[PDB]
Design a binder for this molecule. Sequence first.
Ligand code: ATP
Ligand code: ATP
Ligand code: ATP
Ligand code: ATP
Ligand code: ATP
Ligand code: ATP
Ligand code: FUM
Ligand code: FUM
Ligand code: FUM
Ligand code: FUM
Ligand code: MN
Ligand code: MN
Ligand code: MN
Lengths: 552, 552, 552
Amino acid sequence: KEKGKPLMLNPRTNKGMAFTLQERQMLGLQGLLPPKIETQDIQALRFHRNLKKMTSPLEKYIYIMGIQERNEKLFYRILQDDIESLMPIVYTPTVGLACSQYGHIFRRPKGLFISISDRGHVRSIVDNWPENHVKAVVVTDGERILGLGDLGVYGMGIPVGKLCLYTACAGIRPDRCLPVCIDVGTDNIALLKDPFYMGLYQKRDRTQQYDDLIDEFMKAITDRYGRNTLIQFEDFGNHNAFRFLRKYREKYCTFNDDIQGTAAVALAGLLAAQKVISKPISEHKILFLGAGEAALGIANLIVMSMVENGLSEQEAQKKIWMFDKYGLLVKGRKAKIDSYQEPFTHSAPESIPDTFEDAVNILKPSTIIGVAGAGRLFTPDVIRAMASINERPVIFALSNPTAQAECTAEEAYTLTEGRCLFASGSPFGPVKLTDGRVFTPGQGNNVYIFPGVALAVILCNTRHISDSVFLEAAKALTSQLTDEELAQGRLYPPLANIQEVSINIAIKVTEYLYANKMAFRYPEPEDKAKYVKERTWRSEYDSLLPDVYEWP
Amino acid sequence: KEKGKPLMLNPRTNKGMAFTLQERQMLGLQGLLPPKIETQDIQALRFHRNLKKMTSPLEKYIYIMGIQERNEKLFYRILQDDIESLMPIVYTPTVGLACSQYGHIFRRPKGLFISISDRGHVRSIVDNWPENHVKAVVVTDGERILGLGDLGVYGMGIPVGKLCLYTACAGIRPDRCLPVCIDVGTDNIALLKDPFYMGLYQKRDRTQQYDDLIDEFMKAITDRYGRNTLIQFEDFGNHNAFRFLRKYREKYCTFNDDIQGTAAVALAGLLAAQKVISKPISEHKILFLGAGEAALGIANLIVMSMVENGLSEQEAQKKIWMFDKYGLLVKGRKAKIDSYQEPFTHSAPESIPDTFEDAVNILKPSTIIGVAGAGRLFTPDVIRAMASINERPVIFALSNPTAQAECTAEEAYTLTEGRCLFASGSPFGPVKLTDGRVFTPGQGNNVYIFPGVALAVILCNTRHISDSVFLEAAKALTSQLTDEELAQGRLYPPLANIQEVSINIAIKVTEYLYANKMAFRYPEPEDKAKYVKERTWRSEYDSLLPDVYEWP
Amino acid sequence: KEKGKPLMLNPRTNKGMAFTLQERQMLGLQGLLPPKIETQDIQALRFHRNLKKMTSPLEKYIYIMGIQERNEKLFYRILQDDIESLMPIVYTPTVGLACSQYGHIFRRPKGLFISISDRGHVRSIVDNWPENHVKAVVVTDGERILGLGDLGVYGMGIPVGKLCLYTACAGIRPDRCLPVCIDVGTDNIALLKDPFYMGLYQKRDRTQQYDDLIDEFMKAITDRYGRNTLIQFEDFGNHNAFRFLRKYREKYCTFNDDIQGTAAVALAGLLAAQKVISKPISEHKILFLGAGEAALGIANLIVMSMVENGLSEQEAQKKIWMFDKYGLLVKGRKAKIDSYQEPFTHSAPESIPDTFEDAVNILKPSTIIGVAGAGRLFTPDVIRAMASINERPVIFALSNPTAQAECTAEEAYTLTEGRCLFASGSPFGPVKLTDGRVFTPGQGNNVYIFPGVALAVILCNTRHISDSVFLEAAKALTSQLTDEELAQGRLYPPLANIQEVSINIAIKVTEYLYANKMAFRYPEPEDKAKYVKERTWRSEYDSLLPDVYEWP
Ligand SMILES: Nc1ncnc2c1ncn2[C@@H]1O[C@H](COP(=O)(O)OP(=O)(O)OP(=O)(O)O)[C@@H](O)[C@H]1O
Ligand SMILES: Nc1ncnc2c1ncn2[C@@H]1O[C@H](COP(=O)(O)OP(=O)(O)OP(=O)(O)O)[C@@H](O)[C@H]1O
Ligand SMILES: Nc1ncnc2c1ncn2[C@@H]1O[C@H](COP(=O)(O)OP(=O)(O)OP(=O)(O)O)[C@@H](O)[C@H]1O
Ligand SMILES: Nc1ncnc2c1ncn2[C@@H]1O[C@H](COP(=O)(O)OP(=O)(O)OP(=O)(O)O)[C@@H](O)[C@H]1O
Ligand SMILES: Nc1ncnc2c1ncn2[C@@H]1O[C@H](COP(=O)(O)OP(=O)(O)OP(=O)(O)O)[C@@H](O)[C@H]1O
Ligand SMILES: Nc1ncnc2c1ncn2[C@@H]1O[C@H](COP(=O)(O)OP(=O)(O)OP(=O)(O)O)[C@@H](O)[C@H]1O
Ligand SMILES: O=C(O)/C=C/C(=O)O
Ligand SMILES: O=C(O)/C=C/C(=O)O
Ligand SMILES: O=C(O)/C=C/C(=O)O
Ligand SMILES: O=C(O)/C=C/C(=O)O
Ligand SMILES: [Mn+2]
Ligand SMILES: [Mn+2]
Ligand SMILES: [Mn+2]
């Protein structure tokens, strides 16, 4: 709708020297750009050339995330060129590093910021966002950033990172994505004394005003963009996460990535592992390190899988144990146990375990899943214990970023002598044992799930997301694992093919949504695969020339 | 999103001197307006003062229609002050006069113009319309403008007038209405030699390209604004009208005002008359003057009403006869008889009537409906014949504008000595007979129907409009007629109450759409009346002040 | 700059159907305009066709002034088609009728409004004017609108009308003109009780705050647009008029149209008259009816002319007598005599005249100039006296509008039996005496002067305007009168050629400014005629196409 300099200041439209000569002359850009007409290919080459000379990951993050604020098309072409090598820079673990330093590297803001001080005026803030057709929102309050804790407004880096993957992985239109940070204070003492902090200088408001603010936010967002606007909750504290999920899942189109997204990718990993172990469903014993968002989400999904495979909900729940910061969850312990943990809180065993290692030796689980976000809790002894108890132990260290991981791939594969099936939330390179064998660990991170599910739900005009949708996504993800890849130690499809893998999950989920009368997009497409592929946003430059033609 | 002079140049936001002091200072308008702060009441007074001094209707039309291009809010405020006295100026009959001279009084364009020369680039035309969220489109090709014939692009005045009533009558938001004119040429020889003509100087293109163009238009409109965008076809030629309705009613949210809207108001009138005559359903005999869009639409709607009241479709259709420009529609006549007319084409009677008067004296109908758009065909003899055959004859002269009317109120009431029940498409004032009795004729014009139906369909996110919707609208209109008003000779609710009547029809229709699973707006409101009334656009000025508040 | 709808909403850019196909497609207007591509000629025809059907002058004024708010280019094309017939509608007398009813016919505001309530914030008001390169300002406080009196903010019509002539007559760019109204209240009791009044409801502020405001205005205007911005004072009360001229003429580029502009046109008329009377400079006796802005302005210019032709300043002033509302101006009268009148206030004659007729018989003047703004004071007896005293009496009735004129053309020509040389401020058509002789009276209105002077001053970058500039404009106007036109009774060039006349005056004035080291535009052009003609704004449409071209 506008010509001249503004077309170059808006990263959404700016093509740099790729604007053709005719576009420049017709749009008032001639003279404002160097004479040279470039191609996106030359621009990509300039980027990779500069990236090569850079040393630190944070330096690289600043550079490429900056490109998103300069030339959006080029930004995604850059990710698309090699998503695997750029993932650790734009996503975990470096995104965690960027958040902890957000106030120090700040240059331009990204996303919508809503604070408790704006209560009563949230709608006018939403009306300030430039884009008029938002379809996907990723929101956080920064209380549980990865396993890093409370980073307040510095946590806005997470939503922006997630939304980049929406587009890079599933082809969801960037102009229809909206990262949101809800600022109600922070209990991080270091930030409250940091002069570069970008949020309110107050402790977190935990009164009803907090709930009222979230309510106002959900209403404002949907009032402007539609009741079926996808709203993904990310990195909210344990308490708030479940209650907001329960409270809104039936009234809005929403899901929690740390409860349901992580649950689905974990399940996909276990299904892949079972494909190589073939353990009798009755001999499965799962022990969780932690009992929060991820543990409960994963546990509930594992149970649904066992139920649709014979076992009763009750018998399935008995195969799952949890161990949190206070110890094993057993009936009558002094430490609390909420409604969600009840189903997995069993009667105290022969002896009560003091450490996690004791829990492993006493319960003798076949699977160990780390989701405590508290560092190396899967000690060498915990790993050796699992190797002596099981022929093929399954060890999952899902906490992010790297430093918070329960253990590394190198430790898991070595201490088990290449007999375990390992998956981690953050990346670890291939591991070569002294005997020459090479193991390539998979990354059990929800990035394999949310892009594809988000794409399907949006295309199908789904109103509410049921848990079964994530079970279906879990299956669609694992069903893409080729046997040759399992052999190498991969419990998930190669990260290099995350684009195709995400589109395939969306296709499967879209078919599931229509089959179960959960899709409201009319008419129903006959071929779901063609339907999804035709609607994916591409990073190639579009022509900005007005339609000129002679009249007959 | 903009300030300064532009706020005054856009009729949508321009308040004139009604901009408060704070708005002017905060939006950069101080000094661009006189110091005086006015109210809308004062602005309305200025208008009525000036209107009073004007003489000709066309002069008045140019003035008030011009206000819509200067101050939209004030425009509707003015219509709302006295819709009854302004209706004949902004709508029939004057709008017909305006179209005839459109090129002579042209000042500023309104609506979108799509020509056959634009085939292949229609989407680019649709992208030029400034509004982003259109919900209703009224389109014409100007081939059958009222009973005036082919006026080509001069016919754009009709869609503009219709959309004014959408808002003034049913409170549909103006910024969500789009008047469109499809220009593929004109057969009007006078216009092709007129130097002020606003369209292509060529005969009408009646080849497949025309159909292709309309196809491209329907697709471009829905691609930008949504598949459930209400598309009202207005004043298309007979052949094109039915085939476009049949072709699109199942694939788009569309209806034809001349076939379905007129059918509904006509039926509402008959239902009211029956309430005064109480004639045995078996003794009903309806004779149509004309057998096109209106005749066929009305006939089909009368048949549905009879079937839902006992009679079978077969026997109901036998009570309906039609007489067109070639004479009585009888089986085997030399003049064509298409698919739609077949059900009402009977076996030749005892003697074949030559004139309409012969048809009346031979068939002895109890009801006569004029929809020939060809002038005074209901001659004094025709009327006298009806008064001698029926105690209380029903005479409807629905052709517009006034000069095309089959007869006047004065003629109908006088020649039947006040025994008839009369309704006309164009307005006629009260009639006083030599014996002192005063008769107030009703106006059977679709304006009583499309505003209310359009509102309901838009609010309910209806995907397709069935004919039963118009049957329900017909019933909702007639159920608002108070017995006291029927006595006056009113077959329709007072035009002065058009606003309230349209909202009531909308409520009834929305209740019908939900009850028959035709509404897709979720969640379903419990109280449909409160649902409709809360969403009607109002002509009162809104505050344009930015949201300023302190941070606690 | 802009693209799309905005181009059509701004009268400056809007071309209506004259936008070419390429222009529409490249500027995003395709579909927003009827398919027809028109020329300005066709638009001009539409206008004249509509104007013919109209009856009253006020109705015509509203219509054409409304065009300035829709299509500026077309507006001036229309004036140019026939400036002589539209002059009385856009200018005197109709413009006076319009201002007296400005609040009743208001539709859109024009110009900048500065009120006493904005004292201290005048600059921010000036910063709200959209145009960035203003070169001419016409300002009024509405206290002396024509001979109509105090009309307050209703007087804005005058600065708007004057600027129209800046462009229509001298080709001064419209976007570089700014009409301004200074509102400090009004003493007009009728307006203070009018609900449609557009100004502050308070009597005029005659305190130092008024002077402050005017001073703040001059500084604000010059600060944003430049010290050489031409500021034309128009219709200020007698007291303020002189004091502001004297106070600012040496610090800013300013002049008063009622004092200096009127003076130059009157002088030009006298010079023409002398060309047909050849009366010995010694026997010249001028009697003024009134002794304010115009009389003092004219008197001083006449004096300069006589001095430059022999007579000393002292003896030239002796040939000038003035008669105001209290009687003849004689030394020692009870009525005040200010500094400006002193030079023309002589010793009481043998008998002190009581009426103007008595003043004529006693002083026996050869020239009579009416500038009292008080109606028909040149009674039949006054005129008869002049014809009896002189063979070829010179009678000037310069007050406006028509009703305030001292006498009509018909009155002057008949009562003097065609022997007088007449000129009036308002227009009067040809007069035919009973003997068959036809006399065409000239219009001594400053419109023959300010357009040309204004153009010259602007083009020359003149800093201050001396009284001698007006003397040269007076000579420049008169030197264009052909002998044949003198014969007809014309003291001024035909109004129909006002465009060429203004351009010629501008050329003579720029040559004068350069010759007298008053022009600062560098370099100095060698051919002033080519310099002026090349820079006049034209009403023909310009191409809005972006520069598109192929590269080698
Ligand atoms: N690439 C995309 N990224 C985000 N949302 C998308 C994307 N592609 C399509 N959609 C959304 O998915 C929904 C269904 O898509 P579809 O194209 O069938 O609908 P549409 O109404 O024709 O499109 P639109 O409303 O965008 O013009 C729409 O609401 C649309 O906004
Ligand atoms: N040192 C620890 N040893 C065992 N369990 C711990 C330890 N520290 C914390 N935990 C447990 O880890 C769980 C964290 O749950 P929470 O909902 O906060 O996050 P999460 O999303 O499940 O974890 P992740 O960091 O893997 O995303 C809690 O149940 C907590 O008791
Ligand atoms: N006054 C109106 N005129 C025209 N369309 C309307 C009007 N009011 C509401 N609508 C439309 O009716 C439909 C249902 O109304 P509702 O208010 O329930 O929807 P919404 O999604 O909350 O609104 P919106 O999409 O406008 O923000 C919407 O598509 C809306 O655009
Ligand atoms: N002079 C006539 N006498 C009888 N019938 C006529 C006469 N002239 C035209 N007709 C008929 O009137 C009908 C007009 O139908 P068409 O579809 O063109 O318009 P309509 O919308 O039905 O009429 P209206 O002008 O009332 O809106 C045709 O069937 C035509 O044969
Ligand atoms: N009734 C009257 N008879 C004679 N002189 C009058 C009469 N009424 C007013 N005057 C004089 O006319 C003069 C008006 O001067 P003022 O400065 O107000 O306006 P102006 O610009 O000179 O006049 P014009 O109306 O021609 O533009 C005053 O000198 C005043 O005394
Ligand atoms: N047609 C016009 N109407 C009003 N002002 C004009 C017009 N034409 C030229 N001017 C002004 O007259 C002055 C001298 O004219 P000239 O064209 O020599 O100047 P310039 O500095 O080259 O032009 P500019 O500053 O407009 O780019 C300038 O200040 C210019 O703004
Ligand atoms: O190569 C380019 O045109 C852009 C580079 C950047 O934004 O860093
Ligand atoms: O543009 C930058 O690098 C920083 C801006 C800021 O500190 O606000
Ligand atoms: O009264 C007003 O402010 C506007 C009047 C108009 O646009 O005609
Ligand atoms: O003829 C035109 O295009 C414009 C006419 C007007 O603005 O009145
Ligand atoms: Mn997370
Ligand atoms: Mn119609
Ligand atoms: Mn004046």
